[PDB]
């Protein structure tokens, strides 16, 4: 968010409108890895073995 | 009764149903439940790969 804010304060205004699709999809992709993803050493169970 | 309506559910019940769905689906097309290998999965994954490759290319065009 800081990168986008820095660019907006700088005045490029490149991310306005449809250009925003790059930050938006990245922010969503990061969200998937941190909350879901896969279990650790104490979570050996998974769909392929169950 | 039981099982009817919109009651609560859990994540183990969601995968459990998908297993019964795959196993019953091949029983209609191949008439056997042995399921030595599970081709329905692979045929579906290949489509998802096809769609993803289309999206990667058009995002590449927008970047241009």
PDB file of C-alpha atoms in Angstrom:
ATOM      1  CA  UNK A   1       0.000   0.000   0.000  1.00  0.00           C
ATOM      2  CA  UNK A   2       2.940   2.304   0.726  1.00  0.00           C
ATOM      3  CA  UNK A   3       4.327   1.878  -2.803  1.00  0.00           C
ATOM      4  CA  UNK A   4       0.970   2.866  -4.343  1.00  0.00           C
ATOM      5  CA  UNK A   5       0.614   5.802  -1.902  1.00  0.00           C
ATOM      6  CA  UNK A   6       4.178   6.953  -2.684  1.00  0.00           C
ATOM      7  CA  UNK A   7       3.381   6.927  -6.435  1.00  0.00           C
ATOM      8  CA  UNK A   8       0.098   8.818  -5.858  1.00  0.00           C
ATOM      9  CA  UNK A   9       1.825  11.480  -3.741  1.00  0.00           C
ATOM     10  CA  UNK A  10       4.535  11.738  -6.412  1.00  0.00           C
ATOM     11  CA  UNK A  11       1.768  12.514  -8.946  1.00  0.00           C
ATOM     12  CA  UNK A  12       2.111   9.765 -11.571  1.00  0.00           C
ATOM     13  CA  UNK A  13      -1.602   8.817 -11.383  1.00  0.00           C
ATOM     14  CA  UNK A  14      -0.837   5.702 -13.476  1.00  0.00           C
ATOM     15  CA  UNK A  15      -2.785   3.341 -11.137  1.00  0.00           C
ATOM     16  CA  UNK A  16      -6.038   5.252 -11.544  1.00  0.00           C
ATOM     17  CA  UNK A  17      -8.947   3.388 -13.103  1.00  0.00           C
ATOM     18  CA  UNK A  18      -8.233   0.056 -14.826  1.00  0.00           C
ATOM     19  CA  UNK A  19      -4.500   0.449 -14.156  1.00  0.00           C
ATOM     20  CA  UNK A  20      -5.300  -0.552 -10.522  1.00  0.00           C
ATOM     21  CA  UNK A  21      -5.759  -4.226 -11.594  1.00  0.00           C
ATOM     22  CA  UNK A  22      -2.034  -4.892 -10.962  1.00  0.00           C
ATOM     23  CA  UNK A  23      -1.951  -3.916  -7.236  1.00  0.00           C
ATOM     24  CA  UNK A  24      -5.416  -5.441  -6.722  1.00  0.00           C
ATOM     25  CA  UNK A  25      -4.618  -8.957  -8.032  1.00  0.00           C
ATOM     26  CA  UNK A  26      -1.273  -9.007  -6.173  1.00  0.00           C
ATOM     27  CA  UNK A  27      -2.931  -8.053  -2.869  1.00  0.00           C
ATOM     28  CA  UNK A  28      -5.409 -10.936  -3.407  1.00  0.00           C
ATOM     29  CA  UNK A  29      -2.639 -13.406  -4.324  1.00  0.00           C
ATOM     30  CA  UNK A  30      -0.721 -12.572  -1.135  1.00  0.00           C
ATOM     31  CA  UNK A  31      -3.908 -13.085   0.897  1.00  0.00           C
ATOM     32  CA  UNK A  32      -4.317 -16.664  -0.423  1.00  0.00           C
ATOM     33  CA  UNK A  33      -0.791 -17.776   0.596  1.00  0.00           C
ATOM     34  CA  UNK A  34      -0.896 -16.358   4.160  1.00  0.00           C
ATOM     35  CA  UNK A  35      -4.350 -17.527   5.278  1.00  0.00           C
ATOM     36  CA  UNK A  36      -4.848 -20.838   3.442  1.00  0.00           C
ATOM     37  CA  UNK A  37      -1.801 -22.523   1.888  1.00  0.00           C
ATOM     38  CA  UNK A  38      -0.699 -25.743   3.586  1.00  0.00           C
ATOM     39  CA  UNK A  39      -0.082 -27.182   7.045  1.00  0.00           C
ATOM     40  CA  UNK A  40       3.263 -27.510   8.794  1.00  0.00           C
ATOM     41  CA  UNK A  41       5.132 -30.350  10.480  1.00  0.00           C
ATOM     42  CA  UNK A  42       2.423 -30.819  13.124  1.00  0.00           C
ATOM     43  CA  UNK A  43      -0.239 -31.025  10.336  1.00  0.00           C
ATOM     44  CA  UNK A  44       0.808 -34.076   8.288  1.00  0.00           C
ATOM     45  CA  UNK A  45      -2.775 -34.727   7.095  1.00  0.00           C
ATOM     46  CA  UNK A  46      -3.737 -33.456   3.650  1.00  0.00           C
ATOM     47  CA  UNK A  47      -6.233 -34.136   0.872  1.00  0.00           C
ATOM     48  CA  UNK A  48      -3.866 -36.423  -1.119  1.00  0.00           C
ATOM     49  CA  UNK A  49      -3.360 -38.818   1.848  1.00  0.00           C
ATOM     50  CA  UNK A  50      -6.770 -38.617   3.562  1.00  0.00           C
TER      51      UNK A  50
ATOM     52  CA  UNK B   1     -35.505 -35.451   9.797  1.00  0.00           C
ATOM     53  CA  UNK B   2     -31.698 -35.333   9.729  1.00  0.00           C
ATOM     54  CA  UNK B   3     -29.435 -33.965   7.002  1.00  0.00           C
ATOM     55  CA  UNK B   4     -32.227 -31.784   5.603  1.00  0.00           C
ATOM     56  CA  UNK B   5     -32.215 -27.984   5.550  1.00  0.00           C
ATOM     57  CA  UNK B   6     -29.467 -25.358   5.877  1.00  0.00           C
ATOM     58  CA  UNK B   7     -27.730 -26.403   9.128  1.00  0.00           C
ATOM     59  CA  UNK B   8     -24.059 -25.724   9.909  1.00  0.00           C
ATOM     60  CA  UNK B   9     -21.150 -27.673   8.388  1.00  0.00           C
ATOM     61  CA  UNK B  10     -17.386 -28.196   8.761  1.00  0.00           C
ATOM     62  CA  UNK B  11     -14.324 -28.411   6.478  1.00  0.00           C
ATOM     63  CA  UNK B  12     -14.020 -32.232   6.830  1.00  0.00           C
ATOM     64  CA  UNK B  13     -17.613 -32.602   5.638  1.00  0.00           C
ATOM     65  CA  UNK B  14     -16.846 -30.438   2.577  1.00  0.00           C
ATOM     66  CA  UNK B  15     -13.943 -32.630   1.372  1.00  0.00           C
ATOM     67  CA  UNK B  16     -15.839 -35.776   2.369  1.00  0.00           C
ATOM     68  CA  UNK B  17     -18.686 -34.921  -0.007  1.00  0.00           C
ATOM     69  CA  UNK B  18     -16.269 -34.180  -2.881  1.00  0.00           C
ATOM     70  CA  UNK B  19     -14.774 -37.671  -2.474  1.00  0.00           C
ATOM     71  CA  UNK B  20     -18.212 -39.337  -2.671  1.00  0.00           C
ATOM     72  CA  UNK B  21     -19.003 -37.145  -5.699  1.00  0.00           C
ATOM     73  CA  UNK B  22     -15.864 -38.211  -7.612  1.00  0.00           C
ATOM     74  CA  UNK B  23     -16.347 -41.904  -6.761  1.00  0.00           C
ATOM     75  CA  UNK B  24     -20.023 -41.900  -7.846  1.00  0.00           C
ATOM     76  CA  UNK B  25     -19.260 -39.939 -11.040  1.00  0.00           C
ATOM     77  CA  UNK B  26     -16.896 -42.592 -12.453  1.00  0.00           C
ATOM     78  CA  UNK B  27     -19.442 -45.301 -11.567  1.00  0.00           C
ATOM     79  CA  UNK B  28     -21.742 -43.780 -14.214  1.00  0.00           C
ATOM     80  CA  UNK B  29     -19.153 -43.596 -17.027  1.00  0.00           C
ATOM     81  CA  UNK B  30     -16.804 -46.560 -16.288  1.00  0.00           C
ATOM     82  CA  UNK B  31     -19.129 -48.841 -14.248  1.00  0.00           C
ATOM     83  CA  UNK B  32     -16.434 -49.776 -11.695  1.00  0.00           C
ATOM     84  CA  UNK B  33     -15.342 -48.294  -8.352  1.00  0.00           C
ATOM     85  CA  UNK B  34     -11.808 -49.747  -8.164  1.00  0.00           C
ATOM     86  CA  UNK B  35     -10.365 -46.308  -9.109  1.00  0.00           C
ATOM     87  CA  UNK B  36      -6.819 -47.547  -9.786  1.00  0.00           C
ATOM     88  CA  UNK B  37      -6.009 -44.043 -11.088  1.00  0.00           C
ATOM     89  CA  UNK B  38      -8.286 -41.021 -10.953  1.00  0.00           C
ATOM     90  CA  UNK B  39      -8.569 -39.505 -14.454  1.00  0.00           C
ATOM     91  CA  UNK B  40     -11.544 -37.205 -13.746  1.00  0.00           C
ATOM     92  CA  UNK B  41      -9.209 -35.071 -11.627  1.00  0.00           C
ATOM     93  CA  UNK B  42      -6.537 -34.798 -14.356  1.00  0.00           C
ATOM     94  CA  UNK B  43      -9.023 -33.963 -17.116  1.00  0.00           C
ATOM     95  CA  UNK B  44     -10.415 -31.141 -14.942  1.00  0.00           C
ATOM     96  CA  UNK B  45      -6.956 -29.794 -13.949  1.00  0.00           C
ATOM     97  CA  UNK B  46      -5.954 -29.584 -17.632  1.00  0.00           C
ATOM     98  CA  UNK B  47      -8.883 -27.196 -18.273  1.00  0.00           C
ATOM     99  CA  UNK B  48      -7.911 -25.017 -15.274  1.00  0.00           C
ATOM    100  CA  UNK B  49      -4.369 -24.861 -16.697  1.00  0.00           C
ATOM    101  CA  UNK B  50      -5.826 -23.832 -20.082  1.00  0.00           C
ATOM    102  CA  UNK B  51      -7.836 -20.975 -18.529  1.00  0.00           C
ATOM    103  CA  UNK B  52      -4.868 -19.779 -16.428  1.00  0.00           C
ATOM    104  CA  UNK B  53      -2.597 -19.620 -19.504  1.00  0.00           C
ATOM    105  CA  UNK B  54      -5.210 -17.475 -21.300  1.00  0.00           C
ATOM    106  CA  UNK B  55      -5.308 -15.016 -18.349  1.00  0.00           C
ATOM    107  CA  UNK B  56      -1.497 -14.803 -18.117  1.00  0.00           C
ATOM    108  CA  UNK B  57      -1.315 -13.878 -21.826  1.00  0.00           C
ATOM    109  CA  UNK B  58      -3.984 -11.132 -21.719  1.00  0.00           C
ATOM    110  CA  UNK B  59      -2.451  -9.594 -18.564  1.00  0.00           C
ATOM    111  CA  UNK B  60       0.796  -9.545 -20.552  1.00  0.00           C
ATOM    112  CA  UNK B  61      -0.984  -7.578 -23.291  1.00  0.00           C
ATOM    113  CA  UNK B  62      -2.365  -5.030 -20.787  1.00  0.00           C
ATOM    114  CA  UNK B  63       1.146  -4.584 -19.371  1.00  0.00           C
ATOM    115  CA  UNK B  64       2.319  -3.777 -22.932  1.00  0.00           C
TER     116      UNK B  64
END
